[PDB]
UniProtKB/Swiss-Prot annotation, chains A, B, C, D:
Protein name: Ferritin light chain
Record's function text: Stores iron in a soluble, non-toxic, readily available form. Important for iron homeostasis. Iron is taken up in the ferrous form and deposited as ferric hydroxides after oxidation. Also plays a role in delivery of iron to cells. Mediates iron uptake in capsule cells of the developing kidney. Delivery to lysosomes by the cargo receptor NCOA4 for autophagic degradation and release or iron.
Predominant location category: cytoplasm
Species of the source: Equus caballus (Horse)
Location of region: Catalytic site for iron oxidation: 52-59
Xref: Gene3D superfamilies: 1.20.1260.10
GO-annotated molecular function: ferric iron binding; ferrous iron binding; iron ion binding
GO cellular component: autolysosome; autophagosome; cytoplasm; cytoplasmic vesicle; ferritin complex
Subunit structure: Oligomer of 24 subunits. There are two types of subunits: L (light) chain and H (heavy) chain. The major chain can be light or heavy, depending on the species and tissue type. The functional molecule forms a roughly spherical shell with a diameter of 12 nm and contains a central cavity into which the insoluble mineral iron core is deposited. Interacts with NCOA4.
One of the GO biological process terms: iron ion transport
Length: 173, 173, 173, 173
């Protein structure tokens, strides 16, 4: 209790929930990544795109935890539920699932920001702005762009389009 | 009056008060620093920790003054009261006094931010966020950590614990 | 099914279970790390030791998943249960909990190796040997050493001993 | 006979057979490589992929021979039969033939390892593990991945898919 100042029990609880959501997202991306690495799926560009996102979500959770400790709150961890699917279908299906996931994280961030604004907590506000809200927007725009390109490349020749997208948009170094 | 825009007389007065509080804090840290440099106290790690904080508070006051001029307000200086003590007791006593001081500065920042939000002044809001609120949080967490370690090192052997903290946590380059 | 060769359904299931155990361990270390970063605990050496172990357990899970895909098995993820404690007591308590955890992972590795030897699967054997069994042994020896030193430093002056261990054994760069 | 120790006549014979199988494989890859270099086939990415595999199989045979001499066994060479085909069809046909070949080599390695484990010959075991079993697994996963991508790229437009795979997956420096 020695440092805690202007940090409500409600914000503290909502930051712990958000941490669980970011770790859940990280776990979802780990599964997406290993799915595309299956010898019967074998799209390497799609597998590391999803593995970079896993790392990013884990880092987001870690930033939230550091902040919680900086404000004198107490981290409380809960079970992490498994990803929503065991098999993720096509690149199109996966990118759709990813956007749905990012939008749910975005909405949780907005819900937390609204809470902090109602709680008169400008530090929370500035933290969430500078570290999460803009990265989320940029990420969702990128996924939106990917999805449009995937979608354009379907019809008639789906195997061909899925290969070319991975080779020409996704793949790497 | 040629540039001043959306900058109330109330915010202007509160920024001048905050400048006085930061200079008061800087002066308090100058005294803490020279106290630990006394030949009958002689803890050099504690003396420069407090001298870096003096510089930081002075710079915070200077940032506020620059902003006041940028917005077309007018700096007005008042007498600076002397620090609350002439002798600061133990490292434990001093770190406690320092935390009390930072928390009072933090609360003044929150009070100013609330004022600026009530005044519809988003520039003030962004200024205080990006430059003061987060640094204050980080500083108070660091002092909290120090205090916990000091506290742990007492009982039975206080001289020994105060020496070891200065040597092993504080001291320097 | 195009590549899978000499890889039983039993080994595949046991590798998925082991992956869950390594991720659980990683999560346990994340919680231990943030616990020691609390302003009312404030032992930084203990916090990053535990954060390096979190990364190591995550990497172990990832190595297992890559192997599973190399052999044509299918990764299946389950819920990750939360760590066994919300508060981890002293450095001594924490190091004890860590050793218990590593020994349970070690035993799971031995159980999997025995399975693979009973299944006539020399690739599994060589994989587990070269990548997990020796690292586990080395890690447990290191934790054992830490625990002995912690234990030596208690009696009479526990706060002092816990500070000195963190400063002189643990802490860092 | 001056050095030979714990090395059975049965293992020695099986190592000579395995050497013949690796040289046969190397010869098969030499033929696959020159087939794709025909002016009426002309897929350069597919031709050097197969030429790197020829070199790798030759090196595997050479490693086995060196080991045989290290253990005091005697290399005995037999006729090398010609590859199973004179013309290898499409890239798809060829990659399928390659996987069949690697899996037969893998099975021969497992059969030799089982022999050495039944013969109480831990050196053989460690040799085969560290030098052959893992490389074989990794190679077969890579071929599996290739085959999946080839397969995806067929239907309707086979010429186009075979060109794009060679250009975008296979080809080189
Ligand atoms: Pd506290
Ligand atoms: Pd991958
Ligand atoms: Pd990648
Ligand atoms: Pd990847
Ligand atoms: Pd990658
Ligand atoms: Pd990348
Ligand atoms: Pd706000
Ligand atoms: Pd905000
Ligand atoms: Pd704000
Ligand atoms: Pd003016
Ligand atoms: Pd000094
Ligand atoms: Pd100093
Ligand atoms: Pd000094
Ligand atoms: Pd100094
Ligand atoms: Pd310094
Ligand atoms: Pd505002
Ligand atoms: Pd603000
Ligand atoms: Pd604002
Ligand atoms: Pd398969
Ligand atoms: Pd830390
Ligand atoms: Pd550390
Ligand atoms: Pd740390
Ligand atoms: Pd660290
Ligand atoms: Pd380290
Ligand atoms: Pd074995
Ligand atoms: Pd083994
Ligand atoms: Pd073995
Ligand atoms: Pd001999
Ligand atoms: Pd060629
Ligand atoms: Pd080539
Ligand atoms: Pd070639
Ligand atoms: Pd070439
Ligand atoms: Pd090459
Ligand atoms: Pd063996
Ligand atoms: Pd072996
Ligand atoms: Pd062995």
């Amino acid at each position: 209790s020695q440092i805690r100042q202007n940090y409500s029990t409600e914000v503290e609880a909502a930051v712990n929930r958000l941490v669980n959501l970011y770790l859940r997202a990280s776990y979802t991306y780990l599964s997406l990544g290993f799915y595309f690495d299956r010898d019967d799926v074998a799209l390497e560009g799609v597998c590391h795109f999803f593995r970079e996102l896993a790392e990013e979500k884990r880092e987001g959770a870690e930033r939230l935890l550091k902040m919680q400790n900086q404000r004198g709150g107490r981290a409380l961890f809960q079970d992490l539920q498994k990803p929503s699917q065991d098999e993720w279908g096509t690149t199109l299906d996966a990118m759709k699932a990813a956007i749905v996931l990012e939008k749910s994280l975005n909405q949780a961030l907005l819900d937390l920001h609204a809470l902090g604004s109602a709680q008169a907590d400008p530090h929370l506000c500035d933290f969430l702005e500078s570290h999460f809200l803009d990265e989320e927007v940029k990420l969702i725009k990128k996924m939106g762009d990917h999805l449009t390109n995937i979608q354009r490349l379907v019809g008639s020749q789906a195997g061909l389009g899925e290969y070319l997208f991975e080779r020409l948009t996704l793949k790497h170094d």
